[PDB]
Design a protein around this ligand. Structure first.
Ligand SMILES: *[C@@H]1O[C@H](CO)[C@@H](O[C@@H]2O[C@H](CO)[C@@H](O)[C@H](O)[C@H]2NC(C)=O)[C@H](O)[C@H]1NC(C)=O
Ligand SMILES: *[C@@H]1O[C@H](CO)[C@@H](O[C@@H]2O[C@H](CO)[C@@H](O)[C@H](O)[C@H]2NC(C)=O)[C@H](O)[C@H]1NC(C)=O
Ligand SMILES: *[C@@H]1O[C@H](CO)[C@@H](O)[C@H](O)[C@H]1NC(C)=O
Ligand SMILES: *[C@@H]1O[C@H](CO)[C@@H](O)[C@H](O)[C@H]1NC(C)=O
Ligand SMILES: *[C@@H]1O[C@H](CO)[C@@H](O)[C@H](O)[C@H]1NC(C)=O
Ligand SMILES: *[C@@H]1O[C@H](CO)[C@@H](O)[C@H](O)[C@H]1NC(C)=O
Ligand SMILES: *[C@@H]1O[C@H](CO)[C@@H](O)[C@H](O)[C@H]1NC(C)=O
Ligand SMILES: *[C@@H]1O[C@H](CO)[C@@H](O)[C@H](O)[C@H]1NC(C)=O
Ligand SMILES: *[C@@H]1O[C@H](CO)[C@@H](O)[C@H](O)[C@H]1NC(C)=O
Lengths: 99, 254, 361, 120, 99, 49, 50
């Protein structure tokens, strides 16, 4: 558990990508999660409604993924700014700042 | 032809532990080195399964409620258990399913049968006695297949009625334990899906007599009931289920 | 790039403008072997057909039915469907088929129809008003007819009440034409209901015997065992094709697989529940499904004030699948690779940068 | 690849453009973060071939010539201990160049003190 | 667009309908705007001997486009055997009259 | 407590798991923040009487 | 009816969780600042102005 901080970032990114993949298997109230099955089983007036339900569900999933990615990007940017500060003040010089 | 068996000895049914048996493949999908969580009709781990004997004078052939599915475990030697009786009223009023394994092949029939009160087969020491039905009026489905079959053989079966599909899962296991179910893991492969489309609420095992009155060969079988629950199945590199976790057994497995 | 940025001037940099797609070239549909055919040879072309008061009912179930051979046969003089289409019989699926076979007169062929009133319709064979299926009829003068007269084919002439749909009546009760009591004794106004036809080779068109087979479809909650034939095409590997394997459809490159399936398993899934392995139904072999090489099309340019030269980066795309250079970022077209190292001007990725001096990478 | 789905998706406007632009901003932000952290020197310093530092040993942190990746033993251990429209863009700086930057920083702080961070 | 149809076919003059005159006689688009007007004309468009002047396309190879008119009096091939412009077995005229 | 509502909610996938995971992360983050701010010494020093 | 209620309540809950994540990030930044002040002002004497 020495390198848990990097492993947490890798696991969070991989888990978010896996969740975004797994959101495709949900029908979001439609008859099926497959667009091909809806387009082959129904006429376009009702297939339009079912595809619209799938579109809004997948769009909501993608917006959720992008929002949490932006929040994690802000956290990683703060950590990287801290790392750059430690690089400048601890490696390139001697720091009087305690701890 | 029907014969009442009046030489039985009265005894209460037994009960035993299921351990980690009754697991089957939920689908026809290969999975490699992955853990899959699935919600299906599964047999609970360490559950109370009903134990029936055939020993001499015990001859356990009752009719039991099917519920949502049936797990059939068989500690079998010399092939006493030959088939099953599936239906709702078990008479000519409704339509019933017959599974039989005689000396040559397995026959699966969905017809309007008149079942006997005590149905059995018989081996003379040569099989020359069939007394399981008296009539067959309206058949809708017939299917003849290859034969599925100290206690030496362990036969696991799972019977399910989902969307008019009858799933039969089975597994053959070589054991050498004398009395009870062995403790271990064995995932049941899907054997045959039947397009029956009929209501089934009751079942009955079919045994075979030994003639030399009658004698019951040494056999023992177990009935477990399938409940809707979640399993976490482990798939190895070769794609077989080697271990499972029951999500509703204890908080650790949860 | 000007279209994407909504501006007529483009600043120096790299701009993701489009999305390269490997377009599917062929469609590969693989379906398993068309075996266990329905026994239509023993119903349409049997040795002896039945009479119309005792029409033979054959149950077609648990098999695949080839209606194209039946429809393309020119021997049939009448092929009329009342609930389905003849060209869609090979596409639809039904639970079971009832085949009603009988022989009638040539003038009574029209009487096997919904809403039609006739002697055969009322007393011999009745169809419902919401009938589904097809009625097929053909002439059989060369086989059934005899020079001495074929009297084997009987038909019911009298009954008190009309038939219900799909009802048989093989009873031989003596009809009462009048109101006189008849106890089974024939009289002036009491006749036998079943009369024989007058099939002779000297008769013209209309009195010749016609063999009629009526197919009725059932669409109950039972599974649809009766389906149309499946036309499996040839299998093409190593190309981005649209695959349809046993109802599982998608787009991918189908290559040989080293994954050894167990005999009950058909498809293969990864951690993310995507089908990456599959079994061909015709030949039991395992195929890997690699996704087609989708990528991002990025345009690397200097300022339009400086030059109009551009380079195209296809991200994660090999250069053989699209001044062509292969990078770990993707394929770069339009930039001359040099061995010198400079400062990064336009970032490409994986340590590759582009600059203008022509465009070099 | 469903064209009807894309035709229905066009009714919602430029949501896809916003998602792509946000992800592009995150992707360039990661490269900017790496640039700010590791590229703090514009001179690539090297240690002398003779490692005479008055008894101080830096073999565990200096790059190993025997390894093809030119990493330190500590860096090699660190790299060993870390294990549908989706694309992964490669980072602008490879691991070899980040290792080269750390090697330059180590050589500067060993041979020159804090003087290289403030000037020559 | 003026025409004469049956009493049960007035439901098929609508967007998104599956039907016979919808596919082979008169098709409305899914995004159709306007009004459909229907009224009984038994007093005018009927004769005691049979008014056969109104015809519909019983047979066609494919469904029409919206606002597409087909007046081509070509024979239809309903079977595998070509018809060569001549009626016969599985060769029917596409236009049949209402009785 | 509506089982029909939960059955309809399962059609939407793992949104609820995502929200619970985010709230759990915030909840452990608050304890981590307090641990980082106040627990900077491992010795409990005491003033003289 | 439950589909309409579910989508409305899910949108409300997602909005709440997003606001909580942003506020948690702000509080985490404030706590990191507070830990820095605890290290540099209490556990030592700081030359940093203000
Ligand atoms: C075996 O025993 C059963 C149980 O009594 C017999 O079933 C009954 O037979 C009588 C005969 O008239 C019927 O009236 C009863 O209705 C039956 N019981 C049930 C529950 O159906 C069976 O007949 C016996 N077998 C033989 C061959 O006699
Ligand atoms: C500096 O440290 C390294 C590693 O701690 C020393 O290398 C070791 O040398 C001894 C004897 O020469 C070997 O038995 C070890 O296996 C070496 N360790 C490794 C990791 O290679 C080295 O001797 C030290 N001194 C100098 C001057 O480099
Ligand atoms: C199984 O059930 C029987 C009665 O139904 C009971 O006596 C027995 O204790 C049960 N076994 C276990 C392990 O609970
Ligand atoms: C087994 O049953 C089948 C089906 O009834 C039959 O054809 C076959 O002869 C039977 N075999 C024996 C040995 O009785
Ligand atoms: C079932 O059998 C009885 C008697 O054999 C018969 O009267 C009845 O018509 C049959 N029903 C069907 C649906 O075959
Ligand atoms: C199935 O049979 C049981 C018992 O006979 C009955 O309660 C149930 O309603 C039946 N279900 C159907 C769908 O017929
Ligand atoms: C998987 O199969 C291989 C043979 O190809 C065998 O060597 C290996 O032991 C098997 N592993 C497991 C876990 O069954
Ligand atoms: C008789 O009809 C069957 C219909 O299945 C057909 O397959 C067969 O070829 C026919 N026989 C001849 C001699 O045409
Ligand atoms: C199916 O047809 C193919 C055609 O080449 C044949 O090779 C194969 O043996 C048949 N049977 C099975 C079970 O695949």
């Amino acid at each position: 558990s020495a390198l848990g901080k990097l492993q947490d970032v890798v696991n969070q990114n991989a888990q978010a990508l896996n969740t975004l993949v797994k959101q495709l298997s949900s029908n979001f109230g439609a008859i099926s999660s497959v667009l091909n099955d809806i387009l082959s089983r129904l006429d376009p007036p009702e297939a339009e409604v079912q595809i619209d339900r799938l579109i809004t569900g997948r769009l909501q999933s993608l917006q959720t993924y992008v929002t949490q990615q932006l929040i994690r990007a802000a956290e990683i940017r703060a950590s990287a700014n801290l790392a750059a500060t430690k690089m400048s003040e601890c490696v390139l010089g001697q720091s009087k700042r305690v701890d | 032809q029907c014969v009442n068996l009046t030489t039985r000895t009265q005894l209460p049914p037994a009960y035993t532990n299921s351990f980690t048996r009754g697991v089957y493949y939920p689908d026809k999908v290969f999975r490699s080195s992955v853990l899959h969580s699935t919600q299906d009709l599964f047999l609970p781990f360490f559950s109370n399964v009903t134990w029936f004997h055939a020993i001499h004078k015990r001859f356990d052939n009752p009719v039991l409620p099917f519920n949502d599915g049936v797990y059939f475990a068989s500690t079998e030697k010399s092939n006493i258990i030959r088939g099953w009786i599936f239906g709702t009223t078990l008479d000519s009023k409704t339509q019933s399913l017959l599974i039989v394994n005689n000396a040559t092949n397995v026959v699966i029939k969905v017809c309007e049968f008149q079942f006997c009160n005590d149905p059995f087969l018989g081996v003379y020491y040569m099989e020359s006695e069939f007394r399981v039905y008296s009539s067959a009026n309206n058949c809708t489905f017939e299917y003849v297949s290859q034969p599925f079959l100290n206690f030496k053989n362990l036969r696991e079966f799972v019977f399910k009625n989902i969307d008019g599909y009858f799933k039969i899962y089975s597994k053959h296991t070589p054991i050498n334990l004398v009395r009870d179910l062995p403790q271990g893991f064995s995932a049941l492969e899907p054997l045959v899906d039947l397009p029956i489309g009929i209501n089934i609420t009751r079942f009955q095992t079919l045994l075979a007599l030994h003639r030399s009155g009658w004698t019951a060969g040494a056999a023992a079988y177990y009935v477990g009931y399938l409940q809707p629950r979640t399993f976490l199945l482990k798939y190895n590199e070769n794609g077989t289920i080697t271990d499972a976790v029951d999500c509703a057994l204890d908080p650790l497995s949860e | 790039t000007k279209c994407t940025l909504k501006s007529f001037t483009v600043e120096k940099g790299i701009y993701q403008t489009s999305n390269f797609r490997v377009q599917p070239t062929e469609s590969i549909v693989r379906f398993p072997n068309i075996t266990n055919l329905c026994p239509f040879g023993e119903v349409f072309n049997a040795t002896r057909f039945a009479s119309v008061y005792a029409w033979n009912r054959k149950r077609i179930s648990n098999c695949v039915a080839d209606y194209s051979v039946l429809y393309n046969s020119a021997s049939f003089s009448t092929f009329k469907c009342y609930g389905v289409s003849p060209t869609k019989l090979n596409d639809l699926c039904f639970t079971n088929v009832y085949a009603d076979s009988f022989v009638i007169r040539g003038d009574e062929v029209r009487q096997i129809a919904p809403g039609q009133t006739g002697k055969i319709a009322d007393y011999n064979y009745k169809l419902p008003d919401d009938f589904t299926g097809c009625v097929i009829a053909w002439n059989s003068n060369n086989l059934d007819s005899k020079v001495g007269g074929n009297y084997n084919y009987l038909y019911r002439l009298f009954r008190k009440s009309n038939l219900k749909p799909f009802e048989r009546d093989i009873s031989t009760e003596i009809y009462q034409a009048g109101s006189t009591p008849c106890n089974g004794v024939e009289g002036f106004n009491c006749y036998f209901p079943l009369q024989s036809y007058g099939f002779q080779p000297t008769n013209g068109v209309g009195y010749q015997p016609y063999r009629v087979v009526v197919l009725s479809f059932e669409l109950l909650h039972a599974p649809a065992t009766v389906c149309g034939p499946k036309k499996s095409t040839n299998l093409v590997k190593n190309k981005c094709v649209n695959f349809n394997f046993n109802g599982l459809t998608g787009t991918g490159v189908l290559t040989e697989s080293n994954k050894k399936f167990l005999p009950f398993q058909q498809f293969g899934r990864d951690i993310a529940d995507t089908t990456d392995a599959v079994r061909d139904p015709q030949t039991l072999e395992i195929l890997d499904i690699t996704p087609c090489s989708f990528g991002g099309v990025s345009v690397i340019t200097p300022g339009t004030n400086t030059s109009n030269q551009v380079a195209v980066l296809y991200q994660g795309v090999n250069c053989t699948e699209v001044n062509v250079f292969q990078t770990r970022a993707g394929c770069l077209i339009g930039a001359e690779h040099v061995n010198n190292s400079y400062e990064c001007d336009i970032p490409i990725g994986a340590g590759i940068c582009a600059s203008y001096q022509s465009i070099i990478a | 690849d469903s064209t009807e789905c894309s035709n229905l998706l066009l009714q919602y406007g430029s949501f896809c453009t916003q998602l792509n632009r946000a992800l592009t901003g995150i992707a360039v932000e990661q490269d900017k973060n790496t640039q700010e952290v590791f590229a703090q020197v514009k001179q690539i310093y090297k240690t002398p071939p003779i490692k005479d530092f008055g008894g101080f040993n830096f073999s565990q942190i200096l790059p190993d010539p025997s390894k093809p990746s030119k990493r330190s033993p500590i860096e090699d251990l660190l790299f060993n201990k870390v294990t549908n429209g989706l694309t992964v863009l490669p980072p602008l700086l490879t691991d070899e160049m980040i290792a080269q930057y750390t090697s330059a920083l180590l050589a500067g702080t060993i041979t020159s003190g804090w003087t290289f961070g403030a000037g020559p």
